[PDB]
């Protein structure tokens, strides 16, 4: 006729159409979905509510029986848009949603002379995965997301894959590389769902696989601990008996002790975790214990409260085995009596003089050999971990 | 007919069907409705606002008379899928919630040939129950589920159950194990609520009862305190003459203070609630205070003021038992006259000396005391304290 | 008829009804609606932003001429349930709100046979009502809601009570006890408001009188004060010659400043409120600079400097009135003249050790003095506070 | 006739009636809406957004050609209700909004005989102004809302005013005076807006002129400043050879550091703005500074380092012009010799006990001046901002 | 005829009138829209996130073939307004955006006599673009928004552009300055899109390049960092044998280092980003530990410890080449023995005060030394700083 093509074939098409009824000929035939998904971004990975924000891009197809028209007439069309709410629609969701989506409505389908009937639409995905971070910088983390039919049972609705699963999971066209965290990859699986014996459903779970750039976190939370390792080696380098080196010690600590409060709120939140991390922190924790126990030996040793002399069993053995062996380096009578009174005063402070000159070497001597212990073992520490993070990197 | 048997069946259905009455035909009889709920994860737990946050798979069913046909017609259909949009539904709401909803519309039901109209949703509830926080780590709460109709009366619609009560609380199917909270039962009741004499109403109460996880907090409210704990005792085995025995000490109760006042922000919120957490600071604080007042009446007592000799009457008894009692461990005249000058001089300053040695000896014995006695104080804190700890786990 | 009456009583009262009128048969008459409030919690109060949110049920009733039928027919019905959105509905708001209420709709209303119509909805308000917090632990706070009709002037719509007001402000039935508010009235008013000498308007003005539970914010700004009030103490207790006093003080005065910084940020928010709890501060501030004025002036007494004798003006009288009436407690010559060198140098050392003594007593004596000033001043304090809050708790 | 009035006028007005087209018989005539705007409180400035939030009352009234009816007829009605969506609305919207306003739908709009139509609806405000902080405490600042049609150009709509500009701008009858803000006046005005030489537009714009109310800020400013510079007074008041002088010093140049530090994230916001309290901190950082440099060089003059004697150049003026001018206030020989090496021991001693005198009396003048003038400088400091603030105060 | 123009005019145009079907006579032919973006403010960059939220003024133009009629009827009517939901619009959006736009409803669209239809909106944009700070305060940053319809593929639907790209990319006419980010250029660019080798789309990017005001981080970030440098300077100026510098070394380094430490969350952000303000930290920091590990050994050096004399090796040239090279600057016997015994005794203590002497002499000669290399090599670095801040501004 004279009418336009596209006015008549759609007045000719949605003619007494009913838009609440399954569009098939024999209610015994299922209708069959074919979906599939590919990744846009990770908006967000929360750890401490376990939820997952993430941008896809899904698209899906079916049959529709009373949408069929000969492509002779109505000027040799194969294919037009029509909207969607004026058609039938499958009931498609995600069982681990939390958030309703924030996405826009897509109002048009295409429509083909065969039946079939396409839909795109982007998805704003805020789901909930179990996270683990058990090795928080190196965490490697699957969510699943299972797109199923929320009313209708495996009897009515199965979900196919348009594409091979092959390919599906090696896609990575339009990924956004560059934040937080990399795809690794995108595996879906197909699966029969059923609490009850009762009813029966149609699943397509889709495990996303990604991994976290560590690259940030691991020099910041290594970077202060081994510059205040150093400080604490200049702090060993003072004398023992000035008196400031406890104060030194204690404002170090102090300081460290703040860092790690206010930093440990940030990064750990799950219950259950526990990092490594925390491992390393509390041998920290435990090397400054020694250290501070070992300053406060030092300087009780060294301190003078008028103490006795050095006690001889230890003293023919301790400084003669730090050399060359392990550390390589009438009126007369009144007179006389008068003054042997100032005598033996300063008989008496010069004996005290030498207990105090003996007792201090032995505490320079002991600080010397602590301190070379103290350094050995830190710098066995730090190869440990050194060629521990080696043995990861070369994997 | 030649026409297909849904489309017919959907015709003759929805034909001439009013939504907006009760489907009766006898209005003295009420509408039963059955509902059911099935719990997915707990999202969150507010206690400064006494906010739950959860997620509930809700599935209900009613008797429609108006939705009736013989199966042996429209092709053998036993059951068929219809909008929602075009029947009437129940206002079956929640008396506790705060928040509206943020859930998806599922745009189908189910209608039998009986009548039978079923209806599947997921809920996202936001509701209001009191939290007690007596004992914050171990508390299990129970909060109130309240289902009815908001307008209809009971002479209208009453509310049953699916299932039976037995197996309802014991589902625990698809919980979310991994999380802050873990569920322990959801218990069913029915009920008549009326606050006037005028109407009654029925309402289904579901009292769901949660347990917290405990092994996160625990640990890292107990770990600093003992840690700190270790270094006062090295702060003990100091010296008290040194100086910077009362500086230690005050350093780190300002680290301690500190510490607890930004902790106590954030898990204590409840106006009533008081755990006994806070009574374990408290006792800590104590502790902290007697030893500040031991460091500070030692170094008083040891410090050098010019004093006199120590008084006999303590002296006699105080350094004997503490020793294999309790602790085991002319020109003549001229110059006789000028050099007596000196001799009294240093007379004098030698019985100073002495008595400082006195005065020395006796604060050292007075702090090896009071140390010994704060150490057992402090074992005899900790043994109370483990075996409650043990005494609660084994239950 | 056989057909059922809740169809065809339907059928015949929403034929030909228009919802866009009002449902007067006389324009001059007004349509008179009768509302009322209950109750359900506090969810919040933002003083910062001087923001309520409240949580109500909210139930209101009128009369429609054009929805009345005779009781005989249709099978003895007395009432109906009919679709809100098929009838006309008064725009029943309220003045003071600033969000939009998040509230679910409700479908459904009851209509009598005298055309009765009755409306229960709850409702969540977020309105803004001033807040004074001159006295903030123990403050009682009015806000007001204010009902009325947008824009039908009283010509048209007024408002009445469904209740007395003497049984409205003492309902409390189903208000939340637990929180951080209680409930005290709710007391009804109705006014006639007009800006212009135009148009009148009435308005229900419904005034919200609550308190707040004091029992926590009380203890916990009165436990550090206290606390550190006693630390002082010890501090005082120390010797005035030991030289660590001076970081004593001020390490405990940054402590307390320190957490007056961090503490007064959270709880006074109003620009022209002035709690009296800013003045206990001050009054705590000026009383801990006294004390660091009295430590620094015996510190400057006395610490030596070489300085002179103890002028004898104020000594004869403070050392005697310090005890029972305030506080009760050729060659010969060479030789001669050689050793009169040594002499005079060990006479001038004891001089100047004698001036030492005296300056350090007198310094000990004014520390006492000063101290026990300080303790009855403090003890003073601390009684007028105790009997000030007892007062207020006895009324 | 026997129908209702205002069921039969309302059927004959809405009787063929399209929503969609402007309401004018010739489409030559423009259509005029004249508009107003009550404010009702200032919800919110944000200066880090640069966003104003506010509550309006706006109302406005136009002309509808085809709303005209007889008033003999219809029972004497001038003017009735009719439903907002059954009628033609204008666009009218501000070009400043960020943030879709979530005010609610008024259903209702008032008609007139004479085809006049108002509307009243109220509207929560989220727009973007420039805000200036150069003098923070005492900012007035101006905001524009530029109500104008999105679409229509002038040929079609112009805005004019309700009421005369000269009693819009002086209203204020509903406004909250409690809270931050205070409004000071909302000027009008009438504008025609062209980007394009195309197409022309008219816009109506208001100024709302505010002033912030400064009582709390500057005095929780100015507060801890003073109060610490007191502290510092008597850390001068100090002797500056007890050595704690330089900690004290430190330790109150760090409370102040941290407390600048956390303070200044809160208030300043802008980018571009530099306020005087800036400069006011910088000049207190500086005196704070002189105050160290000042401390370090009288503790480097007074410390003991066997020193020499004080070169007389200085000394001779020195400690005359600052009293009365500025400041007020064989065996013989053996025997002979032997006791001759003691002799001028002690003779050394005694000549570096006496230089240690001088240079500690030098110091102490020195730092008795240094007081004095800092003192001084202080005063006049204080002097001049007293009277900058009292000179602000009287206008 | 006698009725309106407007109104008869909208009758014939709307009349069986489908808005589901795309407006062309041939199939074949696409639908052309252009479409153009005016830039009104930038609301916010987040850079954690890497989210730009931006506010435009969109307008787009197309033709539609079934609305066309005569001008010379109906009154000369060249064009209209017509509501949006009536026609066929086009769905044009942004591949990049990651939350739904809050955007008001535009109701109303132009309609010309010859088919064009145009219309106009705003739109608040929340999209996703990589933002790159490896300078931070000087960044230069591009982003692209896309448009394209999201379902018609080439054939159907290309973009244009409505003016010429030489005009679009310098308009900057309404563009709000203020703020904390400038305007530099929207650059447009026409592209096909196609994942697949199946279908192909039109896209319409723009390129938003942007910078940022770097005055007020600079000043913020550089102040306090050289205002401890000069107080690092007169710590300095401090002798070395007082005791006290170790300490104020540590708390001078304490407050640097909570600092750096509670600045360090806010700007940065990124995990991959690494800007020069951290290799400028990291060079104070070592700039630091120069400083403190150089108190520590010059402390060490001159602190007594009954240490031997200077060995002569380097004395012989130290104390040399520190002056005018570099720095400019019977009764008898027993009598006698017991005289000996006190002369021996001096002679010890003097040899022992003598090397004292010595040791603090060459202390103090390389504290000197060491200040003056410190002071050159601070000079030096603040040199090229500030060279290259002025090699950056000259550009
Ligand atoms: C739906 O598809 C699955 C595999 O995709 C298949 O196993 C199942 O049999 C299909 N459903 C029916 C009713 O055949
Ligand atoms: C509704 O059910 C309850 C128990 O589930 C029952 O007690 C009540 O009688 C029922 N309602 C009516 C009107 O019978
Ligand atoms: C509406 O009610 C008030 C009191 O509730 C009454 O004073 C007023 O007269 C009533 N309105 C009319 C039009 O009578
Ligand atoms: C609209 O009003 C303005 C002043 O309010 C006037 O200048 C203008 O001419 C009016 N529009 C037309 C088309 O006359
Ligand atoms: C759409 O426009 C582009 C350039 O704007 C042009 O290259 C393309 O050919 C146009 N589409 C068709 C179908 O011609």
């Given at each position: ?13 949605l ?14 035939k ?31 197809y079916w ?10 007439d109505?000027?040799?069309?194969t ?19 939390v ?17 079939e ?23 490697v983390?699957?969510?699943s ?19 091979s ?20 990859e995108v ?16 699943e ?7 991994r ?8 910041s ?17 003072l004398?023992?008996?000035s ?7 204690i ?16 990064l750990?939140?799950t ?27 030092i ?19 301790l ?23 100032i ?5 008496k402070?010069d ?17 010397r050999?602590?301190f ?16 521990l ?7």
């Open positions: 006729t004279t009418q336009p093509a596209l006015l008549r074939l759609s007045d000719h098409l003619a007494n159409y009913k838009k609440g009824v399954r569009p098939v000929r024999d209610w015994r299922p209708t069959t979905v074919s979906i599939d998904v590919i990744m846009y971004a990770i908006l967000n990975v929360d750890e401490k509510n376990q939820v997952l924000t993430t941008y896809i891009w899904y698209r899906q049959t529709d029986e009373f949408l069929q028209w000969t492509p002779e109505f000027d040799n069309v294919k037009l848009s029509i909207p969607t709410d004026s058609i039938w629609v499958p009931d498609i969701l995600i069982n681990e949603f958030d309703v989506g924030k996405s826009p409505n897509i109002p048009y389908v295409y429509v083909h002379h065969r039946g009937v396409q839909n795109y639409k982007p998805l704003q995905l805020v789901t909930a995965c179990s996270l683990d971070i058990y090795n928080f910088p190196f965490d983390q699957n969510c997301l299972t797109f199923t039919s929320w009313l209708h049972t495996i009897q009515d609705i199965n979900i196919t894959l348009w594409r699963p092959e390919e599906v999971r090696s896609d990575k066209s339009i990924f956004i590389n560059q934040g937080e965290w990399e795809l690794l595996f879906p699986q197909f699966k029969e769902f059923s609490i009850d014996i009762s009813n029966s459903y149609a397509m779970k889709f495990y996303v696989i990604i976290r750039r560590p690259l940030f976190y691991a020099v939370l290594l970077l202060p601990s081994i510059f205040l390792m150093v400080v604490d080696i200049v702090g060993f380098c004398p023992p008996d008196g400031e080196r406890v104060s030194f010690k404002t170090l600590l102090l300081g460290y002790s703040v860092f790690l409060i206010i930093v440990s709120d940030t750990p939140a219950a259950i975790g526990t990092p490594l991390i925390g491992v390393y922190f509390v041998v920290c924790m435990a090397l400054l214990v020694i250290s501070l126990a070992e300053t406060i030996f300087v009780r040793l060294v301190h003078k409260q008028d103490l006795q002399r050095p006690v001889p069993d230890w003293l023919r053995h400084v003669l085995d730090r050399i060359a062996w392990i550390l390589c380096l009438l009126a007369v009578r009144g007179l006389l009596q008068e003054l042997s009174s005598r033996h005063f300063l008989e402070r004996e005290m003089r030498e207990v105090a000159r003996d007792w201090l070497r032995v505490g320079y001597v002991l600080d050999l602590l070379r212990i103290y350094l050995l073992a830190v710098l066995a520490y730090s190869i440990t971990l050194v060629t993070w080696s043995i990861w990197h070369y994997s």
